[PDB]
Design a protein around this nucleic acid. Structure first.
Ligand SMILES: [Mg+2]
Ligand SMILES: [Mg+2]
Ligand SMILES: [Mg+2]
Lengths: 94, 197, 117, 101, 127
RNA sequence: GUAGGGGAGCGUUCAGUCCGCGGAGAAGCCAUACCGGAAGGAGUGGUGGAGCCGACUGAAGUGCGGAUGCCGGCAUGAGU
RNA sequence: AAAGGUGAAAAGAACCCCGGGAGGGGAGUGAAAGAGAACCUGAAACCGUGGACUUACAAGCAGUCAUGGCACCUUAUGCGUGUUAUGGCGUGCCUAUUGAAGCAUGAGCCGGCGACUUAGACCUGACGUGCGAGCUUAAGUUGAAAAACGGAGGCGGAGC
């Protein structure tokens, strides 16, 4: 989201911005802002009681993009590469 | 700090360049050596002048689309090579002391590995060549190394024509290039190898 | 020595001429026009990266006030409720709830109505 | 057998600061080098003058230069260097070479 | 398979029901008009349409079609009442460039375009 | 960030050195979704049919979209 | 002016088939004819045939971002690759200029050719190295699968 989840997900291995806890099963606990676990809907701080459990699957570089910039009649042309670093996390929590 | 091979066993002499050799100074040397050897032949009719072509064309205005003088400019296919190569030098005078420091420093490199001082090829007998290979075999000269022979014996030289081995160098007319170019230095004839200044 | 262009230009040219895919007419076939098109494409590329971010939030907001109005409210009011119920800090996700979970969306409308009036 | 870098003729290094690369006129497209008008592919507007201060300044002067002497300082003889002796050939050999004057 | 070197000695390349009229002194677009009516038609219809199309490209085209027929039968064993124009196309040969004089001194170039008329016969077979 | 100044580098030919590769397929050409922060670089396959990559160092006729630029080929107007 | 290239060797394709011919298809030679005499490679512009997805209520610097549909699976199955509908956004490039989409300049397209160099015992500065209160050779001479010699002279060294 803004980094570090929330919500009633399931057992999904999603991709988020780098977490620092290097290598497999580095274990991550999430704050939680809403949930539909057992159809029961609860939001903010009342959801804060509950938490999500994640397992750091992998560390990777997101598909290469190219940062291109151009200004006319000023002879301004720019070319630079980019790859965004992520941390893949397996969800398996409350 | 170096011994001998055939004829005696002294050697020991010479205050060889400090510290553990400088590549930068050898670099300065080789460059100069190759710069001097470089022939200055530069095949180019650079000038709009030098190429074979007339002088007026297809009038200044109203021909509709052009503005040209004559068929000899560098913008023309077949014209001059404006800024092309012309015969020149690249030979310069590398300071004396740096040339002296050069080969001394280069010899030092051969001391830190495989150096070789000899007194006469009485171990040769005629030119024969087959017999130079025999002598070389006795002193670890198998052919796995490129070798430089610096002898004044006109016959021991004559027994140097072979492959991945030797380049034969006369009357202490040595080179920082030649010694670095080969793996081992058979410094041999101890004429320049001892006594100067 | 002489050092003619040979191979360098054609390679330089093929690179550009391959970025030119579903480029109409000359824009995909002739170098100068293919290349020229790309300068302008660069403007669109760098701009549309930060633009999609306005584009989506727009779509997000539209879906919110649609559902907010389904339960006699509106985006302006609803959001203030969730803001006034400091506890509620969905912001991101909030549009999907309206669109997929109507049961859940209603709960958040009802909470928003409290924190307000 | 394996791949080897090896030291010698190929291990000879530049020297760091020894010699940098020249100026080839295209560091980006936006190089239409020199000025932007009146700085032209011509053979010099010149660099001196003939009013730009030099003229408009005075003198008839008169130049001469008859005889100029070699300065043999006292500190050279004194302080250090024990009397090897002056004469003519010895002062030269020690350090005061010049001729003609 | 083996490698290229081998393949070249192993499988030697055939052109079944193919014939080409090369360097035909006629403009491609002009010739294409005729060839366009003959594509997909049964070799017999092709032979007949050609005898009645009033364009001068008809003759050369017809000549290729008969050669493609012959080739299909003789060199390829194929059976005739099964034959049809699988493919036909006109490619451009080298242009004969000639200089025409014009008013007030100027000259122009006439392009005398040539054609490579190739037609490919195949056996139809519904099944 | 324009003129401009300063820094680090990519690529081409030639050269000296070293490591190699090649008719069980070299250069060049062609395709590609891979790599590098960019100039760029590699893998695989296809063609080709006899030469060539990599690393360090050296030297340049070393990088093109423009010049009513030059040479050449081919389009448009037009089946007019 | 421009124009080079079969193959190792002419073994330069007897004979057959369509055609007046040109041209082709076979057979044979050869490693290859994916070398056939418009003979090495054979880019690109340009002209075609075939297939995929598409288009006959549409307003357009021709892309770009987003989503849906169809197709495909050899760095390539969550990853895309191709293509396509609709939405948003969007004033070619260069030059010249206070001010360019400009109805201001240039340009039909592609390929190749095509512009900051070289010289001087020159001047002045940065870096670098060698000797260092000193540093250095020029013409030449002798050896040259190579460099050594040569101190005439030049610069520090006192200024007014
Ligand atoms: Mg010429
Ligand atoms: Mg042009
Ligand atoms: Mg004007």
């Amino acid at each position: 989201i803004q980094t570090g989840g929330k919500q009633y997900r399931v057992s999904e291995g999603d991709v988020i911005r780098v977490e620092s806890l290097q290598g497999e099963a580095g274990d991550k606990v999430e704050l939680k802002a809403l949930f539909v676990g057992g159809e029961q809907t609860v939001f903010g701080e009342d959801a804060g009681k509950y938490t999500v459990q994640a397992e750091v699957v992998e560390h990777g570089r997101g598909k290469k993009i190219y940062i291109r910039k151009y200004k006319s009649g000023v002879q301004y042309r720019r070319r630079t590469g980019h790859r965004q670093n992520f941390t893949a996390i397996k969800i398996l929590g409350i | 700090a170096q011994i001998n091979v055939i004829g005696q066993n002294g050697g020991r002499t010479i205050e060889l360049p400090l510290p553990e050799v400088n590549s930068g100074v050898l670099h300065e040397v080789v460059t100069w050596q190759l710069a001097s050897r470089r022939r200055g032949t530069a095949s180019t009719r650079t000038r709009a002048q030098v190429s074979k072509t007339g002088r007026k064309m297809y009038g200044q205005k109203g021909t509709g689309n052009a503005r040209h003088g004559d068929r000899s400019v560098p913008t023309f296919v077949g014209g001059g090579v404006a800024f092309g190569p012309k015969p020149r030098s690249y030979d310069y005078t590398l300071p004396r002391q740096v040339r002296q420091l050069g080969l001394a420093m280069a010899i030092a490199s051969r001391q830190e590995g495989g150096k070789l001082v000899a007194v006469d090829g009485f171990d040769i007998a005629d030119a024969k060549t087959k017999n130079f290979i025999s002598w070389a075999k006795q002193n670890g000269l198998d052919g796995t190394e490129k070798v430089l022979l610096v002898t004044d014996d006109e016959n021991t030289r004559r027994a140097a024509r072979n492959v991945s081995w030797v380049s034969v160098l006369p009357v202490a007319g040595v080179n920082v290039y030649d010694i670095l170019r080969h793996d081992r230095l058979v410094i041999d004839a101890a004429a320049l190898e001892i006594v100067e200044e | 020595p002489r050092a003619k262009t040979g191979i360098v230009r054609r390679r330089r040219h093929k690179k550009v001429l391959k970025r030119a895919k579903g480029f109409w007419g000359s824009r995909s076939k002739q170098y100068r026009n293919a290349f020229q098109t790309l300068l302008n494409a660069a403007t669109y590329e760098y701009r549309d990266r930060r633009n999609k971010k306005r584009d989506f939030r727009r779509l997000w907001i539209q879906r919110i006030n649609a559902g907010a109005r389904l339960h006699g409210m509106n985006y302006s009011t609803f959001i203030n409720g969730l803001k006034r119920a400091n506890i509620d800090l969905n912001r991101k996700v909030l549009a999907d709830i309206a669109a997929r979970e109507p049961e859940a969306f209603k709960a958040l409308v009802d909470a928003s109505r409290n924190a307000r009036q | 057998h394996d791949l080897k870098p090896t030291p010698g003729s190929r291990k000879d290094r530049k020297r760091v600061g020894r010699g940098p690369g020249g100026t080839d006129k295209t560091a980006g497209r936006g190089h239409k080098g020199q000025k932007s008008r009146s700085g032209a592919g011509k053979g010099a507007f010149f660099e001196g003058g003939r009013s730009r201060l030099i003229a408009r300044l005075p003198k008839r002067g008169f130049n001469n230069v008859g005889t100029t002497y070699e300065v043999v300082k006292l500190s050279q003889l004194q302080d250090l260097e024990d009397t090897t002796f002056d004469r003519d050939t010895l002062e030269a050999y020690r350090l005061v070479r010049r001729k003609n004057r | 398979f083996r490698n290229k070197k081998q393949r070249k000695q192993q499988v030697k390349l055939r052109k079944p029901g193919f014939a080409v009229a090369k360097y035909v002194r006629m403009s491609p677009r002009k010739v294409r008009l005729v060839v366009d009516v003959i594509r997909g038609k049964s070799v017999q219809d092709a032979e007949d349409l050609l005898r009645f199309i009033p364009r001068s490209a008809s003759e050369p085209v017809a000549k290729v079609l008969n050669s493609a027929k012959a080739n299909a039968l003789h060199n390829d064993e194929m059976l005739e009442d099964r034959l049809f124009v699988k493919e036909a196309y006109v490619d451009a040969g080298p242009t004969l460039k000639r200089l025409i004089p014009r008013a007030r001194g100027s000259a122009n170039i006439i392009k005398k375009r040539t054609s490579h008329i190739t037609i490919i016969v195949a056996e139809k077979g519904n099944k």
